[PDB]
Amino acid sequence: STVQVFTDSEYQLPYVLGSAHQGCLPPFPADVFMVPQYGYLTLNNGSQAVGRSSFYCLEYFPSQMLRTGNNFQFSYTFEDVPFHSSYAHSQSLDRLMNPL
Amino acid sequence: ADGVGNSSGNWHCDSQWLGDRVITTSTRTWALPTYNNHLYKQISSQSGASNDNHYFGYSTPWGYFDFNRFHCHFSPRDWQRLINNNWGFRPKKLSFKLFNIQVKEVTQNDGTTTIANNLTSTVQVFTDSEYQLPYVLGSAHQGCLPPFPADVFMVPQYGYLTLNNGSQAVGRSSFYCLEYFPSQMLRTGNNFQFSYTFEDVPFHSSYAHSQSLDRLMNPLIDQYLYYLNRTQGTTSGTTNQSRLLFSQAGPQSMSLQARNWLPGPCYRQQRLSKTANDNNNSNFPWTAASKYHLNGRDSLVNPGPAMASHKDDEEKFFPMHGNLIFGKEGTTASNAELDNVMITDEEEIRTTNPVATEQYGTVANNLQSSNTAPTTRTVNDQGALPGMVWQDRDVYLQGPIWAKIPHTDGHFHPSPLMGGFGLKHPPPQIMIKNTPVPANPPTTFSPAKFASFITQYSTGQVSVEIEWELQKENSKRWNPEIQYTSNYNKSVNVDFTVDTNGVYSEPRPIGTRYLTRNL
Amino acid sequence: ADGVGNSSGNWHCDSQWLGDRVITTSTRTWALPTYNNHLYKQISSQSGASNDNHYFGYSTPWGYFDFNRFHCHFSPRDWQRLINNNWGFRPKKLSFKLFNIQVKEVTQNDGTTTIANNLTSTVQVFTDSEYQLPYVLGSAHQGCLPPFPADVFMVPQYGYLTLNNGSQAVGRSSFYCLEYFPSQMLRTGNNFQFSYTFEDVPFHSSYAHSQSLDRLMNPLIDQYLYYLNRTQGTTSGTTNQSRLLFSQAGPQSMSLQARNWLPGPCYRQQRLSKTANDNNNSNFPWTAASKYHLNGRDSLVNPGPAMASHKDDEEKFFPMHGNLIFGKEGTTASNAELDNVMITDEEEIRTTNPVATEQYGTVANNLQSSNTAPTTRTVNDQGALPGMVWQDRDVYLQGPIWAKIPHTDGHFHPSPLMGGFGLKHPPPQIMIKNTPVPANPPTTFSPAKFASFITQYSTGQVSVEIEWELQKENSKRWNPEIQYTSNYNKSVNVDFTVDTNGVYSEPRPIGTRYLTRNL
Amino acid sequence: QKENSKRWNPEIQYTSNYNKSVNVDFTVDTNGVYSEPRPIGTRYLTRNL
Amino acid sequence: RVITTSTRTWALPTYNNHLYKQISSQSGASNDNHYFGYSTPWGYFDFNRFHCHFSPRDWQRLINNNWGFRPKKLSFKLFNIQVKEVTQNDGTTTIANNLTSTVQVFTDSEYQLPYVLGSAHQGCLPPFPADVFMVPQYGYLTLNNGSQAV
Amino acid sequence: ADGVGNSSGNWHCDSQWLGD
């Protein structure tokens, strides 16, 4: 039996990460975890849909099929992003002058 | 050529749009049982069946792979994109791959069933590239790569027919054993590849006509050729006596001009209103249907010649057995209702092809004179005359792609009457089969036929890829054009998607002819 | 590219006869007004017109140049020379030139009118080489380069039709703006050139047949194939009982032989005697005429298939709407007399093509037996059968030269039914127009459409040149042949010349088929 | 900028109504006056946020 | 990329009798509808509308297959220029050629004159190529303290 | 690309602190 795996490098499927959902690599390395299920939303007019709504079939993507013995690799480079400010301020906006 | 833990091939699918061609590839999962218990079986029609529904042939233990439908290759978005920007297209190249093959044994000891792996079992596969076995594709049969990539499908069984004199056979009949062909045997780890090139074929006309045969002239300038317009006398006192008079046809008398061409050939069919109560109250089909008979047995022309469905402002009448009818999702195959089917319309060819319900015209059939007045006759069946120009039947996202032109001495227009491209050497039929694995033999030798095999089936992945050439449109029309769109109105579910139960459906037929051209 | 006092191009005319080809060139003077006041106008048929005489389209401010007639290129002496020595011909190359262009302004202040030069005004001209605008040539319209070189002619106005549902239009209809094309603007001093090459086309058969289909055998030797010639008994006492008897067909029973080919397809038409009193006393045309209808509206087959006008020794009957009818000089275009027109005869094809007034033959239509005698039916409409051989319609000095084969999926015999050579890419349409010159604008800006132009027209010289290939005759006939000649008898005026009032006339039609060949 | 969308079902697009009409859209009338019947916007294809 | 080109015919009268005229709002107008500026004898060319460049078929083709677009390059040409003199002696009018008369044209490439385009004004190259159009007159506004100037 | 009795990849975990 095979297993299918693929990465959406062109950002065509809806991005459901970054919504504070459950199911990332447990904090303790010894814990065995469960792969969450995928799903997405689209435009809706009430409980129904509209013609502008989209349907995505994930079998319609080039994917790699791998058996026991094969493995999958992936590499990625982040783009330029500002440093996160891991510090507090020793001064204040309203008190930024000479006290003398 | 690998082991049991290495996968052969991958899942590709998707499609690529290049400058002048499009490469459409699709992968599916298939299952395959054993057919006829590894036996070739003779099949005759029946004892006491209808004369027309008679047949003799054989059924084999072999499956075959079918992908002769546009929806088994394209997708609704891809189809809409193709038809909304192109004046034509045709196939160029073909690639086929079978991989990730598993043979699974089945055991039954009680109400329950157990399935296990069988790594040493092979599978036979071969392609009839020399076109020696009968070609059963192109007959609008079931079982091609389901339109939705996620669907797992079943390999249909193979069978063929031969000459028959009633329910029996004749010495001229042929028997083909498919084990009598060089075939490739492959286990879990091996895979099968195949490549093919289509031959030259005319582009399919994916456009309508902005002009008409009968209106192809200048609406401002008279003709310089005279035509007889009156037989009586125009002057006073001669209105009751014969006198030939000739006029010139202009924009007003636009129906009496001279012309170069004639509309396509006709083969009249009966008409039906989409409203049940407006039709005759009888079971007229097969008793009032345009049918042709050969070798003493009848047959029905379902598609028939490419002819317009209805006139202008009709939108309610369709010919009986004159256009393709598709089924909606979850529809019974026997005696379905009118609202549960999908009747295709071929009105786009009203400009060139004659309407199917009406006639070709009238022809004089006597020698008029002083004593006898002229008499004409309506003609409903028309052959081919010089100067005839016509258009072919449109193809649809769910319709057939190609067919095999019969190897005969004569052809008139080898374009299939059901659909698209006719090919002398079409894509060959790939046949696949499970080799029989004997059960424990008797300890003492017996010459009897071995008829105790191990029950098992097979599954795998099949990839197809077709490269298609495209013809771009360069029209000088000023105003916008008509194109395919999705309705923006609110709906419970969107078109060409899955419902809450995960069943894929196709709501309407889609035809290619949307852009326009001048005659 | 010159000034106002330098002439562009010269007056060439004349023709050159080379070994295997003839170059025919002709120059004329043309005038051009402004059409529709520089406006595109929608044109619908009418409110309450006949259903068949319905049409929707547009009329533009553009003119176009027509030279699609033999008399607009050849001359009577050249035509007679061509047809009296050649077995065929076809076009090879084309050259077109516009020069000596003047734009003249017109002023009206009273009953008198004044015309002045306008050196700064341009003229637009362009050729539709990509065949995107509707092709209105080849519809036997008026306005090609008059047969006499000294005549000054007028550029016809351009207009086109589109799909119509009654008098209205449909969304599939197209609108073409001719200002939306790259066009060349030229003043007094500039000139326009154009060259074109015809595609491969069959030679036109400028000959008759010295043999016949039904008489193509040896008049001295019997056939070795037997044919049923008697069903009763020849011997005494058996003349009243059935007995099949077979004979061999020889020179005597020459109508019962075996043959290889059949006459061309037929489409019967009514017959008319040239004597008025011999015809029926009714207004039968359009009610007893062979007509074809499409999209629910009728239309008349004026030329129809190429079929012989009459039998031998008839010389008095012609089919209704079965041959081209030309007009004599100074003849009314509405209800002209029989003696004021010129009916062409196509008897030369009696050998191969069936006569138009009569039928194709008879076919058995029942199963004869002892109880029921055999019955046959006459067939007046015949399609295409294997082994059919026919001949095309002749062309005339005043007839059309070519036509545009419609861009469709199917064709049977693309030879136009009205005339000569059918071309997928015919000579493109050259369109010419006068640019609008505004009158004095208002001092205060106004966004309203500018509808106050200066009235003016244009004039110039147009040269055309076609190189034609010729097929020479090499016949083994001993006795002389039939050829075209001028009658030597005394006459007030000679044929194909000008009268005392300087009006050029054509007395009779001239056909190409004068030499002979064996089938 | 070309579109490369993974949407399965078809999309909404601009079209001309096929129904019969006295005059077609974006053309001249019998008096030779050009008219524009409706506004046309560019946004017809779709994308994910 | 797509290259869209269009040609039109234009007419041009004389504005303000070759005079620069000061224009104030009015005496007694609304406070909000106040303005001070000048009107010149100069025309200007406007093509700042899509229908003055594209066509319905081209527009539909562009919007049905693309996720975006933007302008890249521009070319502009004026030619076939005729200056015509007008004479009035009665109810009738006569128009004649004037070959020696010139026409002035210039482009404000340094952006020094006020920019009046982009205000949804009338007078760009009519949507139909066959239409002949009229060059609008130029004028501009400046600071005003009521109906007066500063 | 291996058989059924050969492991792909190993268990790495841990972290490395470099200069920057």
Coordinates of C-alpha atoms in Angstrom, one line a residue, chain B residues 162-408:
Chain B
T162 CA -19.2 -11.8 -35.3
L163 CA -21.4 -12.8 -38.2
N164 CA -24.6 -14.5 -37.3
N165 CA -27.4 -16.1 -39.3
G166 CA -30.2 -15.7 -36.8
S167 CA -29.1 -16.8 -33.3
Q168 CA -26.5 -19.2 -34.8
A169 CA -23.2 -18.7 -36.5
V170 CA -21.7 -19.1 -39.9
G171 CA -18.4 -20.6 -41.1
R172 CA -17.1 -17.1 -41.9
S173 CA -17.3 -16.2 -38.2
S174 CA -14.0 -15.7 -36.4
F175 CA -12.7 -16.6 -33.0
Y176 CA -9.9 -14.6 -31.3
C177 CA -8.0 -15.9 -28.3
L178 CA -6.3 -13.1 -26.5
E179 CA -3.8 -15.4 -24.8
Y180 CA -2.5 -16.0 -28.3
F181 CA -0.9 -12.5 -28.2
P182 CA 2.6 -11.5 -26.9
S183 CA 1.8 -9.9 -23.5
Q184 CA 3.7 -8.5 -20.7
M185 CA 3.5 -10.1 -17.2
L186 CA 4.2 -7.8 -14.3
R187 CA 4.3 -8.2 -10.5
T188 CA 4.2 -5.7 -7.7
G189 CA 7.2 -3.4 -8.6
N190 CA 7.0 -3.6 -12.4
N191 CA 5.1 -1.0 -14.5
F192 CA 3.8 -0.7 -18.0
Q193 CA 4.5 2.3 -20.4
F194 CA 3.0 3.1 -23.8
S195 CA 3.3 6.1 -26.2
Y196 CA 1.3 6.9 -29.3
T197 CA 1.0 9.6 -32.0
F198 CA -2.3 10.6 -33.6
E199 CA -2.5 10.9 -37.3
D200 CA -3.4 14.0 -39.2
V201 CA -7.1 14.9 -38.6
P202 CA -9.1 18.1 -39.3
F203 CA -9.6 20.6 -36.5
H204 CA -12.9 20.4 -34.8
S205 CA -15.1 23.5 -35.5
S206 CA -15.6 25.0 -32.0
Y207 CA -17.5 28.0 -33.3
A208 CA -20.9 29.0 -34.7
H209 CA -21.5 31.0 -37.9
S210 CA -22.4 34.7 -37.8
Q211 CA -23.8 34.5 -41.3
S212 CA -26.2 32.3 -43.1
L213 CA -26.1 30.5 -46.5
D214 CA -29.3 32.1 -47.7
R215 CA -28.1 35.5 -46.5
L216 CA -24.5 35.9 -47.7
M217 CA -24.8 38.9 -50.1
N218 CA -24.8 42.7 -50.1
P219 CA -28.1 44.1 -48.6
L220 CA -27.7 47.3 -50.7
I221 CA -27.0 46.3 -54.3
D222 CA -29.2 44.5 -56.8
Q223 CA -28.1 41.5 -58.8
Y224 CA -27.4 41.8 -62.5
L225 CA -28.9 38.3 -63.3
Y226 CA -32.6 38.1 -64.4
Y227 CA -35.1 35.7 -63.0
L228 CA -38.6 34.8 -64.1
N229 CA -41.0 36.5 -61.6
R230 CA -44.3 36.5 -63.3
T231 CA -46.2 34.2 -65.8
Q232 CA -49.3 36.2 -66.2
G233 CA -49.4 39.8 -67.7
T234 CA -48.8 42.8 -65.5
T235 CA -50.5 45.2 -67.9
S236 CA -54.2 45.8 -68.0
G237 CA -56.2 43.2 -70.0
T238 CA -53.4 40.6 -69.9
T239 CA -53.6 39.6 -66.2
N240 CA -55.5 36.4 -67.3
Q241 CA -53.1 35.3 -70.1
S242 CA -49.6 33.8 -70.0
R243 CA -46.6 36.0 -70.5
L244 CA -43.2 35.4 -69.1
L245 CA -41.7 38.4 -67.2
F246 CA -38.2 38.7 -65.8
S247 CA -37.0 40.9 -62.9
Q248 CA -33.8 41.5 -61.0
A249 CA -33.5 40.4 -57.3
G250 CA -32.5 43.0 -54.8
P251 CA -32.7 43.6 -51.1
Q252 CA -36.5 43.4 -51.2
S253 CA -36.9 40.2 -53.2
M254 CA -34.0 38.6 -51.3
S255 CA -35.3 35.1 -51.5
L256 CA -35.2 34.9 -55.3
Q257 CA -31.5 35.6 -55.9
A258 CA -28.9 33.3 -57.4
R259 CA -26.6 31.4 -55.1
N260 CA -23.5 29.2 -55.2
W261 CA -24.1 26.6 -52.5
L262 CA -26.8 24.3 -51.1
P263 CA -27.5 23.2 -47.5
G264 CA -26.1 19.9 -46.2
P265 CA -27.8 16.5 -46.9
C266 CA -31.0 15.6 -45.0
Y267 CA -32.5 12.5 -43.4
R268 CA -35.8 13.5 -41.9
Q269 CA -36.8 12.5 -38.4
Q270 CA -40.0 12.8 -36.4
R271 CA -40.6 15.7 -34.0
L272 CA -41.4 15.7 -30.3
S273 CA -42.6 18.5 -28.0
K274 CA -40.9 18.7 -24.6
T275 CA -44.5 18.9 -23.2
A276 CA -46.0 15.4 -22.9
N277 CA -49.6 16.4 -23.6
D278 CA -48.7 18.1 -26.9
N279 CA -47.6 14.8 -28.4
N280 CA -49.6 12.1 -30.0
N281 CA -51.2 9.5 -27.7
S282 CA -49.5 6.4 -29.0
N283 CA -46.3 4.3 -28.7
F284 CA -45.0 5.4 -32.1
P285 CA -41.2 5.0 -31.4
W286 CA -39.8 2.2 -33.5
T287 CA -42.9 2.4 -35.6
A288 CA -42.6 6.0 -36.8
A289 CA -38.8 6.4 -36.5
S290 CA -36.3 6.9 -39.3
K291 CA -34.6 3.6 -39.3
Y292 CA -32.3 1.7 -41.8
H293 CA -32.2 -2.1 -42.3
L294 CA -29.4 -4.3 -43.6
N295 CA -29.1 -8.1 -44.0
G296 CA -32.8 -8.2 -43.4
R297 CA -32.7 -6.6 -39.9
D298 CA -33.6 -3.1 -38.8
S299 CA -31.5 -0.6 -36.8
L300 CA -32.1 2.9 -35.4
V301 CA -30.2 6.0 -36.5
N302 CA -29.8 7.6 -33.1
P303 CA -27.4 10.5 -33.8
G304 CA -28.1 10.6 -37.6
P305 CA -26.6 13.2 -39.9
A306 CA -25.7 16.5 -38.2
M307 CA -28.9 18.5 -38.6
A308 CA -30.3 21.4 -36.6
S309 CA -32.5 20.5 -33.7
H310 CA -35.3 23.1 -34.2
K311 CA -36.1 26.3 -36.0
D312 CA -35.9 29.8 -34.4
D313 CA -38.2 30.6 -31.5
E314 CA -39.1 26.9 -31.1
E315 CA -37.0 25.9 -28.0
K316 CA -39.6 23.2 -27.4
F317 CA -39.3 20.6 -30.2
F318 CA -36.6 18.1 -30.6
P319 CA -36.2 15.3 -33.2
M320 CA -36.8 11.7 -32.1
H321 CA -33.4 10.0 -32.0
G322 CA -31.7 13.1 -33.3
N323 CA -29.4 14.2 -30.6
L324 CA -27.3 12.8 -27.7
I325 CA -29.1 12.3 -24.4
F326 CA -27.1 12.2 -21.3
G327 CA -28.2 10.9 -17.8
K328 CA -28.1 12.9 -14.6
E329 CA -26.4 11.6 -11.5
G330 CA -28.3 8.8 -9.8
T331 CA -30.8 8.2 -12.7
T332 CA -32.4 4.9 -13.6
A333 CA -31.2 3.3 -16.8
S334 CA -34.7 2.0 -17.7
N335 CA -37.7 4.3 -18.4
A336 CA -36.3 7.5 -16.8
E337 CA -38.4 10.7 -16.8
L338 CA -37.8 13.7 -19.1
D339 CA -36.6 15.9 -16.3
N340 CA -34.0 13.3 -15.2
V341 CA -32.1 13.4 -18.5
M342 CA -30.1 16.0 -20.5
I343 CA -30.9 16.5 -24.2
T344 CA -28.2 18.2 -26.2
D345 CA -29.2 21.0 -28.7
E346 CA -27.5 21.5 -32.1
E347 CA -29.2 24.7 -33.1
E348 CA -25.8 26.4 -33.8
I349 CA -25.8 24.7 -37.2
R350 CA -29.1 26.1 -38.3
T351 CA -27.2 28.4 -40.7
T352 CA -25.8 25.6 -42.9
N353 CA -27.4 22.3 -41.9
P354 CA -31.1 21.9 -42.6
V355 CA -33.5 21.4 -39.7
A356 CA -34.2 17.8 -38.8
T357 CA -37.9 18.0 -38.3
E358 CA -38.6 19.7 -41.6
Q359 CA -37.8 18.8 -45.2
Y360 CA -35.0 19.7 -47.7
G361 CA -37.5 21.4 -50.1
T362 CA -39.6 20.6 -53.1
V363 CA -38.9 19.4 -56.6
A364 CA -41.0 19.6 -59.8
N365 CA -42.2 16.1 -60.8
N366 CA -44.2 16.6 -64.1
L367 CA -44.2 18.4 -67.4
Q368 CA -46.5 21.4 -67.1
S369 CA -48.3 22.6 -70.2
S370 CA -51.5 24.4 -71.2
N371 CA -53.8 21.5 -70.2
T372 CA -51.9 20.4 -67.1
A373 CA -50.8 22.7 -64.3
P374 CA -47.3 22.2 -62.8
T375 CA -47.0 19.9 -59.7
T376 CA -44.2 19.5 -57.2
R377 CA -43.3 17.0 -54.5
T378 CA -41.7 17.5 -51.1
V379 CA -38.4 15.7 -50.6
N380 CA -37.5 14.5 -47.1
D381 CA -34.4 12.3 -47.9
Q382 CA -31.6 14.1 -49.7
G383 CA -28.2 12.7 -50.8
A384 CA -25.1 14.6 -51.8
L385 CA -25.2 17.2 -54.6
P386 CA -22.4 19.4 -56.0
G387 CA -22.0 22.6 -54.2
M388 CA -23.3 21.2 -50.9
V389 CA -21.7 22.7 -47.7
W390 CA -22.5 21.5 -44.2
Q391 CA -21.2 21.4 -40.6
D392 CA -20.4 18.5 -38.3
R393 CA -21.9 17.6 -35.0
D394 CA -20.6 19.3 -31.9
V395 CA -18.7 17.5 -29.2
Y396 CA -19.4 17.8 -25.4
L397 CA -17.4 17.6 -22.2
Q398 CA -19.1 14.2 -21.5
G399 CA -19.2 13.0 -25.1
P400 CA -17.0 10.6 -27.1
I401 CA -13.6 11.8 -28.4
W402 CA -12.9 9.5 -31.3
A403 CA -13.9 6.4 -33.3
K404 CA -12.4 3.9 -35.6
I405 CA -13.1 4.4 -39.3
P406 CA -14.0 1.0 -40.7
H407 CA -11.5 -0.6 -43.1
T408 CA -13.7 -0.6 -46.2

